[PDB]
Amino acid sequence: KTFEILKHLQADAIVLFMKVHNFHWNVKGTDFFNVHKATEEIYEEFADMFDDLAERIVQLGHHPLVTLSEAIKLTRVKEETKTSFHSKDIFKEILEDYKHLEKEFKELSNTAEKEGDKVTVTYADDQLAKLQKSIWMLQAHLA
Amino acid sequence: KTFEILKHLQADAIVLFMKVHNFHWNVKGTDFFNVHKATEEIYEEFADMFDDLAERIVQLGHHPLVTLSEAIKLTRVKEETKTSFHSKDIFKEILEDYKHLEKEFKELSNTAEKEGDKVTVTYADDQLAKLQKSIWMLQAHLA
Amino acid sequence: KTFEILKHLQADAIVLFMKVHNFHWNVKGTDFFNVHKATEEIYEEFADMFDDLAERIVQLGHHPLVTLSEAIKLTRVKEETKTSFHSKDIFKEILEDYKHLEKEFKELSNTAEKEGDKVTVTYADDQLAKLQKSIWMLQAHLA
Amino acid sequence: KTFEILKHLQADAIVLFMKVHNFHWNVKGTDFFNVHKATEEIYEEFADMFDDLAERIVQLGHHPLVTLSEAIKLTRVKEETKTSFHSKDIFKEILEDYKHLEKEFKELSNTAEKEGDKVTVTYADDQLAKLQKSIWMLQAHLA
Amino acid sequence: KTFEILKHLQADAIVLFMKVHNFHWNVKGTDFFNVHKATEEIYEEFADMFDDLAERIVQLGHHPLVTLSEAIKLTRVKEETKTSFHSKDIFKEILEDYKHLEKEFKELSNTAEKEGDKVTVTYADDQLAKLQKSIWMLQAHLA
Amino acid sequence: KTFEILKHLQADAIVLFMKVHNFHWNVKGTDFFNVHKATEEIYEEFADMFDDLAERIVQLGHHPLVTLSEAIKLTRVKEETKTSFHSKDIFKEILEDYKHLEKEFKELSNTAEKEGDKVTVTYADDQLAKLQKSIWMLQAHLA
Amino acid sequence: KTFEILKHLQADAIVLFMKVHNFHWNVKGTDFFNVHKATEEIYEEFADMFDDLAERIVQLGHHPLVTLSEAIKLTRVKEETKTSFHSKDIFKEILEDYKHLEKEFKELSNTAEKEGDKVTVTYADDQLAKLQKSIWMLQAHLA
Amino acid sequence: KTFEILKHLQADAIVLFMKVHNFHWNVKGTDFFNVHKATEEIYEEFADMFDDLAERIVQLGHHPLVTLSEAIKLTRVKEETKTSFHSKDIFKEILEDYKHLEKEFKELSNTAEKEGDKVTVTYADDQLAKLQKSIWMLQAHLA
Amino acid sequence: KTFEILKHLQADAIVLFMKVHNFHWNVKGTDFFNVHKATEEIYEEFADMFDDLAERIVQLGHHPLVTLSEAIKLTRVKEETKTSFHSKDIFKEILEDYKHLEKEFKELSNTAEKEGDKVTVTYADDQLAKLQKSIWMLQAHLA
Amino acid sequence: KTFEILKHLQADAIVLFMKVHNFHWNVKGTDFFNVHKATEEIYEEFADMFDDLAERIVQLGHHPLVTLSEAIKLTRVKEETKTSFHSKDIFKEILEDYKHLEKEFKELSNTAEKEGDKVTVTYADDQLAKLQKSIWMLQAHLA
Amino acid sequence: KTFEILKHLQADAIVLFMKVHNFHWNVKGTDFFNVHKATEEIYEEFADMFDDLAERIVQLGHHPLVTLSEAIKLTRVKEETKTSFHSKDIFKEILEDYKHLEKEFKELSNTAEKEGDKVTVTYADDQLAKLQKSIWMLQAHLA
Amino acid sequence: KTFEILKHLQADAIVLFMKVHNFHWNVKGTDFFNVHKATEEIYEEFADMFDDLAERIVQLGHHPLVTLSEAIKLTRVKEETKTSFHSKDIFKEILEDYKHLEKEFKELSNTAEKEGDKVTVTYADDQLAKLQKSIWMLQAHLA
């Protein structure tokens, strides 16, 4: 079901919104400004992904998650409880979650195609493109 | 303690970010576009308030909340589980939470002054100004 | 006399500037933001009309009104003392005053033509165009 | 045939351009400005869709329709002869035609795929995305 | 009657909107980009003229044409059925229709003046200015 | 009472809006363009101050003045009846009224603090900052 | 004849373009920057007036002047041979030429009306509006 | 293999970057500015295509070509050694290479689909859309 | 003498300003819009060159020419009396005058260097760069 | 005395303007561009702080420092004579001076309050907010 | 030596930055706004000149001055201790220092040429151009 | 010969365009975004230098290189075959090639001067200025 994948991805998106803010506030190192700036852009992307997933759910005639409580229940992303990081820790963690999201959007694309949902396929493949680009660049940071 | 008020307000800000998205997605009525547009601007304001509160906490040498789990634990805002609203329901609910926030920022302003924290006073009073304006306009919607 | 029509219109323009602010501040209803926004644009137009009429008077070698006292003496617009309105009340009142202004600018156009004042004719006809458009749209609100 | 679907959609697009202008000019109610503004954006979208469909037809080596006469002959949209509407009438009518267009673009996407026309598939699916979003929002107006 | 001239001009404007799109899509020659660009600007002008004429009709308290069917019935412009043109053919055809429009707006200006309609005179004379400029430039293309 | 100071300041703001227009239209001297430009910016500031004071009054749950009649009754600013000025006359007069406003906003700040109105204090102090800067610059003109 | 007035005005416009450059380069006094800036804007206006008059002549089917030689022959403006001025000299001279132009555009408006040339009337009256405004402001400089 | 098609296309993109610069510098005819401008936009598109292909290769975990030497070895585009062209020569040559690229991106789309590479399919189909549009317009130049 | 070359170039610049307007107004052919647009940019460049030369003369402590009469006396450019041109005629004529200007700026550069005038050398060489580029492009039009 | 604190802060601001330029020019390391960019923004802030402090002094009716000589005499900041730094050295030094400034603005805020100077309190607290934010971020660089 | 001239000019640039701020803050007269605005632009130019000279020194492999102490030691500009000026005093003083700078940049240009330093010649000549223009305009203020 | 230096520099510019793309795609390290961004700006500069050199060659009446084959034959830059770099490797390599280019533009400047080619001297010296600045900043990265 396309709806089931979408709803779990919506949960992930708000959890990541929060996680990346953590990295944003609590990064240490001569690298601060770069990472602080980059994490800001990343959490804005998750805020947008969060809105988009929810509105696609609505367009499909279902209910998006509407509480942080549901988000916590439905997410596959582990919340980060540490409050201090250097650039390499942050980029490693975001990479791991991106790889998770990438597999989820591959499934989204495949599932929506089976169900003949052309619009969700287009959305999934577009997110896939953004994720695969970011994945490379993050891997490049860590090499 | 200024830190204690800030941390609960940070929790409220992310809970409201979520609540207002609910209103944003699930508003019904000939009024749709106005409310959809207005709720978008409101949740962006809460996203900004969320970031600002957290960074003020950091500047004070403490840890902001970094998980949705903490946010749920610390918030004074009840999460909205309904998935359908007309303009009047939405404006009533936001008004109620604004009045809650307004009292919290009054306390923030007073507490930070007692502790000689001029910067947090300035921040609290500025939020107070924005809230008192919005409160009027929301009351005007419902009259 | 072209000057006499201009001077009374200048008085009307500042009185309407004030009247529309009243509507702007004191509108009630789910309609608030639309009307609040629209009345803002309307009073800016009257501020501009006020300046333009006065400077045309100066160009004609006469004195514009320079006090609120003169404005009160010279206006044909009744000042609104109520402090609470819904969208329909506001649009009705503005419509009534627009119809008054429209007849005044028709006379302005005709009088200035008789006196061979081509520039005031052009100005009058341009205001006429703006007024006749707004009149339609206001009538449409009330139908 | 991809060409046959495209040519009928081109006819629909110009008919809708006209229909939405009708709604644009002849809307009544306190809602006027919202609907007047929204219908303007909608007819611009149909003007763009009209141009795009015609140029895709040309790229396919065929002739687009070039007269209003052909448009009338080829359209599946009934022309609206009423000259007065409230917001709910307008949103109902546009919704009905959007649902028609949505089914047409689904067929377009499917047909072009059978014929191996990747570019028309991409175009169809993109229009599908825009339509499905608008359909939700229009349904939301009427609930 | 001012209304009668306006209604036929409204019909012409939408017919020309269509005709110029034809030229836009189906121009041939090393000249392509210039003509393609220029015809785009021209059809946007006719779209604007179409809207303006219709709204002036509404302001006069009458009904504008609201269907392509009426437009076909009321137009004085012959629809172009050819699907291939070089720059000189296109500029010749547009010139011919501009000369037709120019005579219509001269009548519009004269008729509205007789009926004391200052606003329509201003509108007619402004269109006249745009047309007479374009007429020269088109004649210059063909010399 | 904070309300009482605000209401008299609202009256002053519209009276000054008018007075500065007088200076704007009726300035003489090689200095014309500078003063004409500067007085334009000044009256826009008073228009803004007028709106802000009135909306703060509304936020406090009271009625702002809504007529020029009330404004005349409540103002402490004497209206200027002269219709001719040089730069030095104008700058002297504006300086005198600024000094009056400055004392009023000092009282506003002090009174609102006594009543625990943090938002009005912030507003008063901000206006105070703008006024004290302008006062210096005006004094500099006259030295 | 409308053509005859236009051709002499075209000559005046290029002569004034040159004259105002003189003022622009050769102004003296603490006033330098204001006058230097203002004369720049004025000569740009004459460059535009020059182009517009010439293209209106072309639209009328006649030849505009195409040489400085013709301009010298046809102008009613005396060329300024002095190479040093203070602000008051400059504003006096421009005022004198504006008054000349103003009478010429009055004649233009009247003559074109007699000949039924609506477009030239509109152009003349628009220039008249700009000139009468500038005339006031220049008179204000010298008072 | 998707990688093999991408690498040859990367080579083509830099070769075309160079070829189009040739046309850009060495175009002759009254047509100069149009072609000079158009070829500039075209080579910027190839520079972008070059970067995109290379970064997609990197995202796939392979090495893009990194030398002009490899580009020369791998390209299917013949380099243009002439140093003088008219508009028709240039548009013919670019058309021929576009048709080559179009077939390559069709294969890219098909191959990536077989290998389940959704992101490269999306990229290929998007380039296909741009190419098919440009192909039409170039054919139109030559007709 | 640097002054002598500058003064004759100032005369040329205003003569060319006029000549290029001629081409601008009186160009014929399917080429109209390109040439009309290009000649507009060219005469703006001569207006700028005219101002710059004159102000450099002033900076050198001498008097620039201040009348069209002096310009006619001092110019080396023959005024164009024809009132009809095709693109090739226009580009030929501008080319011829550019070649004249180019030799003049070479002399300017050389003369100012002999006299140790570094600023005029820089100005001359910069104009030389612009001219040599334009000369190529014009030659390209005619090949 | 508020004046005494302001005057020493004015001295500090110009000394820091100079010190940060040193860091700006003479930073070494792979970090160069980040630090070079960041130090540019920092010295612009000190230039602004310098101007603001001086103009506040003027508004208070006193004389600001007007020479580098006074600045040297009055500053509490030690001038940096080294001409080579890595990012960590630079951020350490700026941090130390920020902490000094922060204590000075705390005193400024407190002193101005005692003297009833509301405007200087507002200015001090605003600078305090900017400083406390920058202090955190600099500390984060060094952790 | 090019370095020696550059280092003294760097000292002058920061001294002038300070001197012009003095004029900026402490100008008196109806002229205030013009001079206040103009001196702001002038000190920004000296801030830029200061940065540029220092970075050119660095590019030459030497150390720029890095303290106000060195600046005071190395400058040829006398610091202004007065705290009150009218427009004419200010423009006289800036003129005198500009003439000093102009001679310094002439030497810079000549010296760098002898040493074969083409880049410093270009920089010197460019500053020379800006200075010679400003010198004229300042002389014009005082005539 | 100026032409010979230009043609080899044109070859270098396209080779460097390619080399810097290599660095752009294949940079590794926490530094990724900075270097990726900086190398993008650098290759755009080489693309611009490539175009400029070629068009200067054309202006001189000769043929620029028009194939990658010629570029390979004529370049003095060794192509980089590695596909992995850290920031320090990249900045070292670009520095080395900049130093090569710098010596080439010194020769260009000297040679063009001998041949009396003022325009190429200006171009060479301008590139020299950009290169000497970049050389410093790159050296600073590596210190």
Short mmCIF file of C-alpha atoms in Angstrom, two decimals, chain C:
data_model
loop_
_atom_site.label_atom_id
_atom_site.label_comp_id
_atom_site.label_asym_id
_atom_site.label_seq_id
_atom_site.Cartn_x
_atom_site.Cartn_y
_atom_site.Cartn_z
CA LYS C 1 -14.89 76.54 -11.09
CA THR C 2 -12.37 73.69 -11.24
CA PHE C 3 -10.67 74.93 -8.05
CA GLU C 4 -13.90 74.69 -6.02
CA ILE C 5 -14.54 71.05 -6.99
CA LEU C 6 -10.88 70.14 -6.34
CA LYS C 7 -10.87 71.69 -2.85
CA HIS C 8 -13.99 69.80 -1.73
CA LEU C 9 -12.59 66.57 -3.19
CA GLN C 10 -9.34 67.18 -1.24
CA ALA C 11 -11.44 67.42 1.93
CA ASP C 12 -13.29 64.21 1.03
CA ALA C 13 -10.01 62.37 0.41
CA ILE C 14 -8.63 62.98 3.92
CA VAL C 15 -12.01 62.25 5.55
CA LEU C 16 -12.12 58.94 3.64
CA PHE C 17 -8.49 58.22 4.61
CA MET C 18 -9.74 58.38 8.22
CA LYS C 19 -13.05 56.52 7.61
CA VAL C 20 -11.34 53.57 5.88
CA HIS C 21 -8.80 53.28 8.74
CA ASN C 22 -11.84 52.87 11.00
CA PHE C 23 -13.05 49.95 8.84
CA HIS C 24 -9.46 48.64 8.74
CA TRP C 25 -9.07 48.52 12.55
CA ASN C 26 -12.59 47.56 13.52
CA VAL C 27 -13.71 44.89 11.03
CA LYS C 28 -15.05 41.66 12.59
CA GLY C 29 -15.71 38.20 11.06
CA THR C 30 -13.92 35.17 9.53
CA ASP C 31 -13.35 37.66 6.72
CA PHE C 32 -10.97 39.78 8.81
CA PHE C 33 -7.67 39.36 6.91
CA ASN C 34 -9.18 40.02 3.45
CA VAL C 35 -10.97 43.19 4.55
CA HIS C 36 -8.06 44.37 6.74
CA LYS C 37 -5.72 43.96 3.73
CA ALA C 38 -8.17 45.53 1.24
CA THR C 39 -8.94 48.57 3.43
CA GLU C 40 -5.20 49.17 3.83
CA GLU C 41 -4.81 49.42 0.04
CA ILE C 42 -7.89 51.67 -0.14
CA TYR C 43 -6.65 54.21 2.43
CA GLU C 44 -3.27 54.35 0.67
CA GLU C 45 -5.18 55.26 -2.50
CA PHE C 46 -6.99 58.07 -0.64
CA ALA C 47 -3.70 59.32 0.82
CA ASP C 48 -2.39 59.47 -2.77
CA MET C 49 -5.57 61.12 -4.06
CA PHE C 50 -5.29 63.65 -1.22
CA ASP C 51 -1.72 64.58 -2.18
CA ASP C 52 -2.52 64.71 -5.91
CA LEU C 53 -5.59 66.96 -5.53
CA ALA C 54 -3.67 69.35 -3.30
CA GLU C 55 -0.72 69.57 -5.71
CA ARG C 56 -3.04 70.11 -8.68
CA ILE C 57 -4.59 72.98 -6.68
CA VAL C 58 -1.08 74.42 -6.16
CA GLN C 59 -0.29 74.03 -9.89
CA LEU C 60 -3.45 76.05 -10.60
CA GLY C 61 -2.02 78.88 -8.46
CA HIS C 62 -4.38 78.46 -5.51
CA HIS C 63 -4.07 77.22 -1.93
CA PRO C 64 -4.99 73.66 -1.00
CA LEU C 65 -6.60 72.99 2.37
CA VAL C 66 -3.87 72.64 4.98
CA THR C 67 -5.76 71.77 8.18
CA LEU C 68 -8.12 69.02 9.36
CA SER C 69 -10.37 71.90 10.44
CA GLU C 70 -10.81 73.05 6.81
CA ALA C 71 -11.25 69.42 5.75
CA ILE C 72 -14.14 68.99 8.22
CA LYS C 73 -15.72 72.25 7.04
CA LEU C 74 -15.43 71.42 3.34
CA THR C 75 -16.22 67.69 3.16
CA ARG C 76 -19.43 66.16 1.79
CA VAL C 77 -18.60 62.83 3.42
CA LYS C 78 -20.25 62.04 6.75
CA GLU C 79 -17.76 60.75 9.31
CA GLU C 80 -18.39 57.25 10.67
CA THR C 81 -18.68 57.11 14.47
CA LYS C 82 -19.36 53.35 14.80
CA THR C 83 -16.43 51.22 15.98
CA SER C 84 -17.55 47.74 14.86
CA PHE C 85 -18.39 46.35 11.39
CA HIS C 86 -18.73 43.18 9.36
CA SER C 87 -17.49 42.95 5.77
CA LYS C 88 -20.91 43.79 4.25
CA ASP C 89 -21.36 46.98 6.31
CA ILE C 90 -17.88 48.19 5.27
CA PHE C 91 -18.33 47.45 1.57
CA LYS C 92 -21.75 49.15 1.56
CA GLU C 93 -20.36 52.34 3.14
CA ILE C 94 -17.32 52.54 0.83
CA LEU C 95 -19.62 51.95 -2.17
CA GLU C 96 -21.83 54.89 -1.15
CA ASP C 97 -18.85 57.24 -0.85
CA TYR C 98 -17.36 55.97 -4.15
CA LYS C 99 -20.63 56.83 -5.92
CA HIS C 100 -20.40 60.33 -4.41
CA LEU C 101 -16.78 60.68 -5.57
CA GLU C 102 -17.68 59.36 -9.02
CA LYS C 103 -20.27 62.13 -9.54
CA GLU C 104 -17.75 64.70 -8.28
CA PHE C 105 -15.07 63.58 -10.75
CA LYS C 106 -17.64 63.64 -13.60
CA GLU C 107 -18.32 67.29 -12.72
CA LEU C 108 -14.56 67.91 -12.37
CA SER C 109 -14.00 66.52 -15.87
CA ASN C 110 -16.85 68.58 -17.36
CA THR C 111 -15.97 71.83 -15.54
CA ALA C 112 -12.24 71.69 -16.38
CA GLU C 113 -13.11 71.07 -20.03
CA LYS C 114 -15.33 74.20 -20.10
CA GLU C 115 -12.40 76.19 -18.66
CA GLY C 116 -9.96 74.59 -21.14
CA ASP C 117 -7.98 72.82 -18.40
CA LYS C 118 -6.78 69.70 -20.26
CA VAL C 119 -4.56 68.43 -17.42
CA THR C 120 -7.36 68.37 -14.82
CA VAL C 121 -9.65 66.63 -17.37
CA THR C 122 -7.04 63.87 -17.79
CA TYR C 123 -6.69 63.55 -14.01
CA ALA C 124 -10.48 63.48 -13.46
CA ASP C 125 -11.08 60.85 -16.18
CA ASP C 126 -8.29 58.64 -14.79
CA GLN C 127 -9.84 58.77 -11.29
CA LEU C 128 -13.21 58.09 -12.91
CA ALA C 129 -11.77 54.89 -14.47
CA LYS C 130 -10.42 53.67 -11.11
CA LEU C 131 -13.69 54.54 -9.33
CA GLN C 132 -16.00 52.86 -11.89
CA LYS C 133 -13.94 49.66 -11.67
CA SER C 134 -14.00 49.68 -7.84
CA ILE C 135 -17.74 50.47 -7.84
CA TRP C 136 -18.47 47.33 -9.91
CA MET C 137 -16.31 45.12 -7.65
CA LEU C 138 -17.95 46.51 -4.49
CA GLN C 139 -21.42 45.99 -5.97
CA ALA C 140 -20.32 42.43 -6.74
CA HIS C 141 -19.41 41.90 -3.04
CA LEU C 142 -22.94 42.91 -2.00
CA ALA C 143 -24.87 40.83 -4.56
#
